[PDB]
């Protein structure tokens, strides 16, 4: 049995970072050589393991989380980081054991006039727990007047769109991220 890594990396759609997918990898043989031997991956950072020593270990379960963020924000997909993505969208624990990889997906995820399918949470009253993320659409009460479900002043929708556009600099271009957790 080959682990379904191709189902995660070469997927047609990717999730928004606030609603990122997790596929639980179980009861299979995983060949991590086809991964670290690829020119597409602009980032291949591993924590707690060596990328070439991967094909020598076993684990009970492997988790593959995937989503789309900006290139500016891949630096937050790492243990001990802060920022609107780590704090309010995707949080890695400080004792993280696994690999974080990313690659530029401008030609896939950005479009002329802006791509408004990819969203991130901009407002949350508390930091996410590592491996705790919310799907909520309740509007954010920024004042003392309750909002009563009416988006207005001091009553903001919690998500914005990236509006990925193919013309911006590299830091604003969409990047697809896959995080592998080992346990």
């Amino acid at each position, epitope marked *: 049995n080959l682990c379904p890594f191709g189902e995660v990396f070469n997927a047609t759609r990717f999730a928004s970072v606030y609603a990122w997918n997790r596929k639980r990898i179980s009861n299979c043989v995983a060949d991590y050589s086809v991964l670290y031997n690829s020119a597409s991956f602009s980032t291949f950072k591993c924590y707690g393991v060596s990328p070439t020593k991967l094909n020598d270990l076993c684990f009970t379960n492997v988790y593959a989380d995937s989503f789309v963020i900006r290139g*500016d924000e891949v630096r937050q997909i790492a243990p001990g980081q*802060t*920022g*609107k993505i780590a*704090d*309010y969208n995707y949080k890695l624990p400080d004792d993280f054991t696994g690999c974080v990889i990313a690659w530029n997906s401008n030609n896939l995820d950005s479009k002329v006039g802006g791509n408004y399918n990819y969203l991130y949470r*901009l*407002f*949350r*009253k*508390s*930091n996410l727990k590592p491996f705790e993320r919310d799907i909520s659409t309740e509007i*954010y*009460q*920024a*004042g*003392s*007047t309750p909002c009563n479900g009416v988006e207005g*002043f*001091n009553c903001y929708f919690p998500l*914005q769109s990236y*509006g990925f*556009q193919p*013309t*911006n*600099g590299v*830091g*604003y271009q969409p990047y697809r991220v896959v995080v592998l957790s080992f346990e």
Partner: antibody
Framework: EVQLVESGGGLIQPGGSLRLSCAAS????????MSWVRQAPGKGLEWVSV???????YYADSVKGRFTISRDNSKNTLNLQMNSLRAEDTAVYYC???????????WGQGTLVTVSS | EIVLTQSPGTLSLSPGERATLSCRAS??????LAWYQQKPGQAPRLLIH???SRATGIPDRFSGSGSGTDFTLTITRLEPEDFAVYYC?????????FGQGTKVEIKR
């Protein structure tokens, strides 16, 4: 109706410390991105520090290790603890609400900080 | 950091004329640019954000354009209370930086 009122400015000696305060009226500072922006007399604008709605804090490189941003939920107050003040830091200090750590849509009137011997 | 250079430094026009202010970024900031107005002795006021979206209560004679490194702010029909100092501020990367300002004085 909404309001941001700075306080705690004045004359201070070099190397001394100072604490700035900003009272909010309709905004709950604990639920917002709040920022401090300073303006030297006759020069431009310079962002100082921000506190995220979740507690994360960031500082401009010119005030790192010396300034500390904080807030106080029982009094709905944004605070800036300035230490080791130089001449340099003489400016009018504004508290602004920060919309998503992007732009500054609502400002206060400012308080003047003078660092002179 | 991004250095925002505004031009011209001083813009001397008569009320009713059309004002065009430029702001250049040292490197691209996409549409993450805001414009502010400051009158002497009082605090800055948000005019547009997102390079082209007016803030709340901003008259339609204010409009923004541009993306990447080139931005323009345009007052179409200058009212007498539009004569002030105008700053641009980027929130694309790095520390958030302001322009050094353009004054729109009155010509006579």
């Amino acid at each position: 109706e909404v309001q941001l009122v700075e306080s705690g400015g004045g004359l201070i000696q070099p190397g001394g410390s100072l604490r700035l305060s900003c009272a909010a009226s309709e905004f709950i500072v604990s639920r917002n991105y709040m920022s401090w922006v300073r303006q030297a007399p006759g020069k431009g604008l310079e962002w100082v520090s921000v506190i995220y709605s979740g507690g994360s804090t960031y500082y401009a490189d010119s005030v790192k290790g010396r300034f500390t941003i904080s807030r106080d939920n029982s009094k709905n107050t944004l605070n800036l603890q300035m230490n080791s003040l130089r001449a340099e830091d003489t400016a009018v200090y504004y508290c602004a609400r920060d919309y998503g750590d992007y732009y500054f849509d609502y400002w206060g009137q400012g308080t003047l900080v003078t660092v002179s011997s | 950091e991004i250095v925002l250079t505004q031009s011209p430094g001083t813009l001397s026009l008569s009320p009713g004329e059309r004002a065009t202010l430029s702001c250049r970024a040292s490197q691209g900031v996409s549409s993450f640019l805001a414009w502010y107005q400051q009158k002497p002795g009082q605090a800055p006021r948000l005019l547009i954000h997102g390079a082209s979206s007016r803030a709340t209560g901003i008259p339609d004679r204010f409009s923004g354009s541009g993306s990447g490194t080139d931005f323009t702010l345009t007052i179409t029909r200058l009212e007498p209370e539009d004569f002030a100092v105008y700053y641009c501020q980027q929130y694309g990367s790095s520390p958030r930086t302001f322009g050094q300002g353009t004054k729109v004085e009155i010509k006579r």
